[PDB]
Amino acid sequence: SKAIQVAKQVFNTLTEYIQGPCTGNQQSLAHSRLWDAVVGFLHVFAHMQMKLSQDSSQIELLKELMDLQKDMVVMLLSMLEGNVVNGTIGKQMVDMLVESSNNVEMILKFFDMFLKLKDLTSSDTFKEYDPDGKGVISKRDFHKA
Known part of the structure; x- marks a missing residue:
């Protein structure tokens, strides 16, 4: 948790060098190794979001x-x-999407x-499947539904 906060807080102060569109400050950052840093960060997110969505002990994390x-993405929104x-x-941002396909x-x-x-829970074919409605349905009837 403490290693993310420093990566988040360094991401915020990367936005503020760009946002008010000082065009030279986003020229000299697009020619850097920024794209290599954000390519690897997605590779963390795609894998980690699955395995920490297995128990409530990681849902705090x-x-x-x-x-x-x-x-x-608020940062590379501000490059565009x-x-x-x-x-x-705009072209290179597709490049770090194809080289990170x-x-x-x-x-x-x-x-x-x-x-x-939301809408499967908001569908009355499911809303009266096992229960009327209480905070409880099933596992096996939730399976087939």
């Missing part, structure tokens, strides 16, 4: 991993805010799991 995951269309900084799809397929959780 996973919120801090989720919080850094939000705090990473001076583009035109086929802009240079295989690992960005684990989190997208991870977010699809819990986004469908």
